Subunit: 389 residues, 4 copies
Amino acid sequence: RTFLNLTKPLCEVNSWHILSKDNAIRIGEDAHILVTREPYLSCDPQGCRMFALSQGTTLRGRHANGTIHDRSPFRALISWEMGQAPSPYNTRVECIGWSSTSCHDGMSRMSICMSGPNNNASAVVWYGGRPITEIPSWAGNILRTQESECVCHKGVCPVVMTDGPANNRAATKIIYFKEGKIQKIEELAGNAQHIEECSCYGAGGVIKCICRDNWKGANRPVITIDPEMMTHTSKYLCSKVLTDTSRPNDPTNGNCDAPITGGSPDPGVKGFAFLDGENSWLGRTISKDSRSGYEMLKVPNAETDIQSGPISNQVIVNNQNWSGYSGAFIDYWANKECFNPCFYVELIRGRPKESSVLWTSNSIVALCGSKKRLGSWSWHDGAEIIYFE
Amino acid sequence: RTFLNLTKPLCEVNSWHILSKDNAIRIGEDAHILVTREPYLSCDPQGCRMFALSQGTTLRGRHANGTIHDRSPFRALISWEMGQAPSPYNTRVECIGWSSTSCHDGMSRMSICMSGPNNNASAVVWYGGRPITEIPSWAGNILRTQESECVCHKGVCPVVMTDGPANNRAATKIIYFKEGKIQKIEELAGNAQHIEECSCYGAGGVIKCICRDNWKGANRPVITIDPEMMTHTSKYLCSKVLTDTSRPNDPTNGNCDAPITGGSPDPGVKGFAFLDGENSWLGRTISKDSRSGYEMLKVPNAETDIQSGPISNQVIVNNQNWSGYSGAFIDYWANKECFNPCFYVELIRGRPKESSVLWTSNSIVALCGSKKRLGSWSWHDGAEIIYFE
Amino acid sequence: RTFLNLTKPLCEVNSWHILSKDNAIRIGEDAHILVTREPYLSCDPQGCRMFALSQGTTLRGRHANGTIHDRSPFRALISWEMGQAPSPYNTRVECIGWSSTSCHDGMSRMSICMSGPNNNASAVVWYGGRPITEIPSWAGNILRTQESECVCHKGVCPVVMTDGPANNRAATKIIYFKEGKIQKIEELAGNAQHIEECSCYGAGGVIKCICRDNWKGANRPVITIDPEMMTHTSKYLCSKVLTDTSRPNDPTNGNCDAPITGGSPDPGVKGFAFLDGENSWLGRTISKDSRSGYEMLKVPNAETDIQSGPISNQVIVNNQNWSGYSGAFIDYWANKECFNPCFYVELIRGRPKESSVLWTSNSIVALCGSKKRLGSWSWHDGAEIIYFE
Amino acid sequence: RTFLNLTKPLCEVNSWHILSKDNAIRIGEDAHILVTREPYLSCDPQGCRMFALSQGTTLRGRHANGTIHDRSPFRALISWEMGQAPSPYNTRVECIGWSSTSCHDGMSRMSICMSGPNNNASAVVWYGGRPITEIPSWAGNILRTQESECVCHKGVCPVVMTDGPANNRAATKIIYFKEGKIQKIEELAGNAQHIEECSCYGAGGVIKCICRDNWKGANRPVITIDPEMMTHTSKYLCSKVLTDTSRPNDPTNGNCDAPITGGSPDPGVKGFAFLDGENSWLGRTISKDSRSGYEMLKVPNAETDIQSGPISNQVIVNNQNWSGYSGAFIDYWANKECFNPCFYVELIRGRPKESSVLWTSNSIVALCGSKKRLGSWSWHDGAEIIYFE
Ligand SMILES: CC(=O)N[C@H]1[C@H]([C@H](O)[C@H](O)CO)O[C@@](O)(C(=O)O)C[C@@H]1O
Ligand SMILES: CC(=O)N[C@H]1[C@H]([C@H](O)[C@H](O)CO)O[C@@](O)(C(=O)O)C[C@@H]1O
Ligand SMILES: CC(=O)N[C@H]1[C@H]([C@H](O)[C@H](O)CO)O[C@@](O)(C(=O)O)C[C@@H]1O
Ligand SMILES: CC(=O)N[C@H]1[C@H]([C@H](O)[C@H](O)CO)O[C@@](O)(C(=O)O)C[C@@H]1O
Ligand SMILES: CC(=O)N[C@H]1[C@H]([C@H](O)[C@H](O)CO)O[C@@](O)(C(=O)O)C[C@@H]1O
Ligand SMILES: CC(=O)N[C@H]1[C@H]([C@H](O)[C@H](O)CO)O[C@@](O)(C(=O)O)C[C@@H]1O
Ligand SMILES: CC(=O)N[C@H]1[C@H]([C@H](O)[C@H](O)CO)O[C@@](O)(C(=O)O)C[C@@H]1O
Ligand SMILES: CC(=O)N[C@H]1[C@H]([C@H](O)[C@H](O)CO)O[C@@](O)(C(=O)O)C[C@@H]1O
Ligand SMILES: *[C@@H]1O[C@H](CO)[C@@H](O)[C@H](O)[C@H]1NC(C)=O
Ligand SMILES: [Ca+2]
Ligand SMILES: [Ca+2]
Ligand SMILES: [Ca+2]
Ligand SMILES: [Ca+2]
């Protein structure tokens, strides 16, 4: 056991293979499955786990009614063995709250959750399963964070947090942790105009966080973090291939340093990309308006070229099925000379798009890169809504 | 592993951060969750766990009917991973009976349960998960104990027990254990006139037990124990801020050495406080009459000053929601230079306050000290009783 | 770490303290609890576990219907953490069949199950979780064994087995195992005329098995086994206090060497006793006709004196409640200078005594000796049969 | 821990003893049990586990409806502790997909699953719980594999795969893995004309794979693999005792080098055999037409003599009960001088044979060889289909 160092480059990726799928809604139709949303996966030296914000009720329970609501005193971050569906019997409570992140540094796991009222939230930072630090809201408006895993290097794990408006300038900070203790706090710098729900990974000693601009941009903000110097820079993804949801049609040219407006009717969704020159892949919903479908697009130089377009594609979820948030993770402890990109897609079921039921929940699908040319099919949730009526 | 020694001082506390909530009643409305009461938490070198007295049925089961009853041959102390809800599938039986205490001495856990008929109860003392000692009733009237964790120092774990009337003078003893064997027994001494359900913690080589006087006082008795000499003193919390339930209004002056009587209609409830000069916090139900709401009041010198009032407060459970028992615990194995205060609140649902159902049970919330000034909100149970009708 | 040696003497016993109780039937009214019968307990260096023969269905399942039947291809020996109820989620399948025994030699656990048709059953002997040895029926009539734990000394664990009529002379053997391999087989010798379902325990290098004579005696046969020499003798309990069920009134004198007959209407039930001169205790159903109630009786010199009677008694289950099989076990790995006797009572619910349901199952209660004079109460099953109607 | 090698000989087998049975359909009538099919068992240094392809839904759930269907994005290979029934709470996801194999090389477990659309399937190869290698379909027609365990020798684990028509010549390959990495690929060679679903086992440094010819033969193809040279040969079982399902009556002579045609109405079923000169056993369904009943036949020189007939038999499942797939496995880590043959029988319930329900699933029974002459009885599933109507 030692601290993880981000000493390896990203593996070449040409295709995406299936890693895990929990079929939670299908199973939760009759088994005791907790309602969730905002899932992800995170790994450690022993393997990978799935994570999500429980709503403190089962899917078939009468308390599933009303779970469209994002914040309550009944939510908590829970983790479970990858592949299983989350039940009250197989899940570990990482922390209490309604927004979270988590990562392993090679020694222990840090987990963070925000809870409390809108104008007075606080974060609690846990390490090795114990509470270490507490951070009060600094802008009095829903202190909140990534909703996917953080990334560590030589013991130092940066985390992106925001507090302030969802539709206006907000106060974002990069907080650098070691064993759950604050090493440094920076205010967000650079040209990104709004930051939410960053999806982050590391490679070659560099951490990149592709985030959600909920205020103006249909293009995604990118923050580049040096976890050794504990400094960062920010801007937008340059590609004309817009990846936020509710975006206009892709334009002739993207914009590296300003948001591209437009889209209807959603201001944003969590998402991700892996940016590695020619070896760059962008995820997005297939629908430009809604959280339906999901596609991976290989867009060489998407980080630096406003003219970059797709040279290959892979449908992860067809546009006849619902998707949701998407984010990045990597099994940094794999026995490979490169760090292989993985991602998950949250498959939201229920409200508001399916209003024949009273609840909102999701299942999870996750895939990682392949150098091979693999065939594919749609990994939709798979549940029949009529069965819940 | 080594014996825990109470060598550290209490951490400074200015507010309370969320530690855990199990949402047991919400989840138990449709998953297989045990009916409980008298819950608490207790930690060890590896972490913290939740404890409670099962009723030997699930919340939705037909045998949940009648569970307002406190004592039966179908109760047992159970423990389980912090944050999970107590099911028949994830709970460890610590011992059999209907009143208990438990604590880890740094090497192993000691667990104690009382069972039997009112006029002939006995305690069984467990250590390392094996029964070590048995203790028969000495006053033939519901031999009973703490209903929250005991505390250990150099292997010596004092426990406060009582046998005798609930509504008149009784026979309290402090029994000193090491590896589940009786080292010494003392009869209660000092100015506390009635002792029940003590909530105890350790700091700076001194163990403090804040208890319930079910006979006269609305102020809580306080026993101070020297675990090395195995001797003690007792009196009452000096503060005018009364913390028992069914208490009258706070008077102008409290009384260190005599009970402050009054209040209606109930003689008492298990509660707690941390007492450390200016760094003192008293918990109580917000209602002076019923087990509803729960608030933490910072009252400097509450332990010694009859005129001490609150300088701050934090609502833990709003007064439109049910509370219950409350008690102290500490993660004595945390990687801190001080012992940080934690507490839990039992959130009782069902009878007698909610008679639309035939059962009585509870969920749990737990919080710990923070040196920061954190925002707060209500951590009420969150179940809808109508769903159970 | 090492093979257990039976070198310690039995602890002095003056009353019985509660060890465990699973409340399976109460819990199983709603939770997913397996139908069982023929339970017992058995310990190893880490702790104690509960055992029983599942019927391959849950209590509330439609397949619980018809579970009065003793033998099917759907039964198996399962073990689980002491105190929990047996569910499909927390039980380990030891082996497959419809008669069993099990014991730990200090290194690993041996478990044995018989299965197959009446005229052609077979035993499979398991060790450390792997199948070691198979034993075919020698008399073509329901090869069967103890239905409670065996006992090992220096790695040698003798097991008593019977093959032959239940209501006439049969063929009993003592098979000595080591690591699941047969070391020696002996034909039953001595004065016991019929042997079934032996309840065995060890002390001072000697193993005593108290059994059920289903053919003639209402007094119980006693087999004494020397595990080093691998030899034995047999006779009956001498006491006039008869302990099998469906017995006549206790006569003026018992008989050391021949069966005391009589009783109505059933030939036998599994039972046990601890025999240590003055320190001797006999368990039996309170009713002399049916398996109801259960009492422990201290009968000095029960093993040698035909006029020995009780000098103390403890009611374990009141005569208004159903009991069932009873058997011996000891936690040989306790941190004590003596081996402390323990026993369990099988609490049978359903058919044939409770015919308003279609199933037969049980719950378990277990107790151990105390040197103290402890109060007591009835530890009956606690389920309300009407809730299953 | 070392790499396992196959130098030991097969144990002599004269009868079959019961190893395990999970009773999953009986139990799943009321507990939360996953719908499965294509089960098997596989062992490692610690013991054995049960495997199967889940359908991503419980047996009682509404999504059970439609589970006759073999391939969907909702299936996954799951493993669990031998003897338990597969629930959402005790199952490990080995990989995602609708065809699999798995085996332990003495150091870690390799698991492989195929998923994707019929024309573009892909395999993901896992080792030690991590994804290692991906393989795209090469014939573009349902790439598929063994549905029972693979076998490893000195780090090398051969796997047989097929891609192509089910009803005509297809493209079978042997792929040799080491730590999940491809060491070599071979096209099928020899006189076997069609290969599906091989049941494989090792002894004397040689792996034999007994398969299913779904195109022509009612006799079973046999593939002999040398795991050191990484080469193979193929032909058919010589015996007149035909072991596929939907076969004609046994002819007077079998055929070592060509398929024997006939039987109605089904083209084949996964099965197995142990081939060891005189010590040879063939399994098959009792019915020549349908997947009903199951018998083991000892047929000396079945691998080499076309006139070889049975010299003994054992009924495993009577012909009044449904059977299904059957396959081979061995506990190669047993403490024995020889490798003892084991096998399982999949017990299919529901569609198409039991059309009164909407689902298809199964339970499992497994047996291993014995040198003794043990009696036997039928180990059928035991659920009442009426209870599911
Ligand atoms: C802390 C919190 O409530 N986060 C919520 C965020 C915010 O609403 C937006 O990022 C605006 O800040 O996104 C969601 O609401 C959403 O769009 O589904 C889900 C998530 O629970
Ligand atoms: C899951 C689904 O049905 N998605 C469909 C959506 C939704 O019906 C609307 O977004 C509802 O507002 O509409 C589309 O035009 C889109 O947005 O891509 C087509 C897509 O197939
Ligand atoms: C052993 C026992 O019965 N303890 C019970 C005590 C006593 O009744 C009082 O302390 C009076 O002695 O408090 C309760 O009843 C109560 O107030 O809810 C709960 C608890 O179960
Ligand atoms: C949980 C709850 O509703 N509490 C309410 C109680 C209860 O109605 C009574 O205690 C029932 O006896 O009444 C109050 O006046 C009080 O006690 O402060 C107001 C409080 O909001
Ligand atoms: C193997 C077997 O069937 N054992 C059964 C035995 C025998 O019937 C008797 O000992 C007569 O041999 O006792 C029972 O039937 C019984 O009385 O409740 C239960 C047990 O299952
Ligand atoms: C559990 C129970 O009800 N036991 C009762 C039994 C049974 O009813 C009969 O044995 C059934 O045949 O009858 C008694 O006379 C007896 O045996 O002592 C009284 C006892 O209270
Ligand atoms: C990958 C796949 O679908 N395998 C299926 C195979 C193929 O149909 C045949 O081997 C023909 O190739 O056999 C089954 O269908 C069957 O007979 O019950 C079950 C199994 O799921
Ligand atoms: C389980 C069962 O009932 N099997 C019966 C089968 C099936 O009914 C048919 O195969 C359905 O196609 O028919 C038989 O003639 C046979 O196959 O030997 C008799 C056998 O008892
Ligand atoms: C096979 O394993 C055995 C037992 O570990 C070992 O003695 C032998 O050297 C190995 N044989 C080969 C050929 O590797
Ligand atoms: Ca946006
Ligand atoms: Ca009081
Ligand atoms: Ca008898
Ligand atoms: Ca065929």
